[PDB]
Chains A and B, each alone.
Chain A
C-alpha cells in the first residue's frame, strides 16, 4: 500500500499468492512461447547502415587487357571508393586525345562513363560537349537505334543531376519502358539524386513523372532519402500535379511520412544552412505534408484541448444555468409538428414567454 508501487517479480507475496505459482508446487515451464517464429518482424534499424556505399555505382567492368593498358590513364579516373583529385579538364583532354586510338565501343563507353562520373564529382558542367561529340549522333537522335550501356547511361544521368542540367528529359524518356528500358536497374541512390536535382531545378512535371515511374517500377520509397523527396515535393505549385502529389503521398510508410515532415520542418527552419541552395517557401506543400503526417500517424487523446469549448445541452444544464433559453425547445417541437403536418402548415406562433435579454 502507498504511492510507491509494488514490483510483483521481486515481491514474494505476489509470486506466492493464489494468482501465481507457490514454491511448494512443482516449478516447471508452462505453455512454452514462440513469438519470433509465428510472426518475425523484418530488421528495420533506427540508425542508417553505417557501411553503406551512399553513392551511385557505375559497374565498371572491362576486358583485363584494356584495363591494364589504360591503367596509366585510369589512375586519374575514380576507382572503387577511391577518388583522385585530378583536374577534370586533364582527363577530358586525355579522353578526347586517346579515344579514337583504342578500337572498342564498350571500352570507349566505359571510359566516357568514368569521365562523366569524375566531372560530376567535381561538378564540372563543361563535359556535355563530350556527350554531344561522341554519343548524341548514334545513341539518341532522330530515332537512334543503338542500345547504350547501362554504365554509360547511369553515369550521364548522375552527371546531369549533379550539374542540374536541362538535358536529362531527352535521356529519361528514352530510358522509359518503350525505349531502352533501363528504369528498373536504377539504384535508389540514382533516384534520390534525380529527385533532389529536379527539386532544386524547380521542374513541375519532372517530379510527377519521376514519382509515377518510381511507383510503376517498384522503386523503394522508404530507402529513398527523405531530403530528396522533400526537395522534390517543395517545387510543385500547379494544381494538377499538387493533387497528384496529394494522392501519391499515401504510398510512403508511416515512419517515412513522419520523418519527411520532420526533415521538411527542420530544413525550412533551422536546417536552412544544411542545403547549399536555400529552399523556396512553399507553405501549401509544407502544410499538406504536416497534415498528411498527422493523418497517417496514430491519434492520441487530449480531452481538455478537444472539449475546452464544450457546452452542455440547454435542458441538461438548465438547473446550473441562471439565464438559459427554454422556449427554444417548444419552438423546435412546434417546427417538428408543422413539418410532420399534425399542426397546421406555417401557423403563426406568438412568443410564449418574455425575452430576458
Chain B
C-alpha cells in the first residue's frame, strides 16, 4: 500500500480503463527493460542528432542540487570527473559509486531499476508477510 498525500485526496476507482498513453501518474516501471538490438531506440530520444536535454546542464547561478534529474543522460565526464552523482528513487536515492563506460549515452532513469526486486522483511506485517509467503515472494 503506497503511502502518499494524494492517496487520500484521489481514488483509484478500481481497475478503471484510461485513454491510451494518458494515465495520470506516469510510473515507467519498464525503463530498465533490456533490449540489445534496440539499445539506442528504447526509452531514449528518437533522433541521434538531438541535443541533450536541458536537465543535463546548469542554467542559472545555482547553489547546488541534492540529486540530478532522471532524464539527465550519462556522459563520459560523469565517470571521468569522479564527482558525486545521485538520482532520486525509492526509497530515498541511488548514488553512482561504480562509474562504468558501458552506460555512456543512456538516461539515468533507464539505468536505475524503478521496481526493485528486493523486499524489506522489517516493515512487513504479519498478515502482509503471510500474503507474500502465499504469493511465493517470501519464504
Please say whether the chains A and B touch (CB closer than 8 A): no
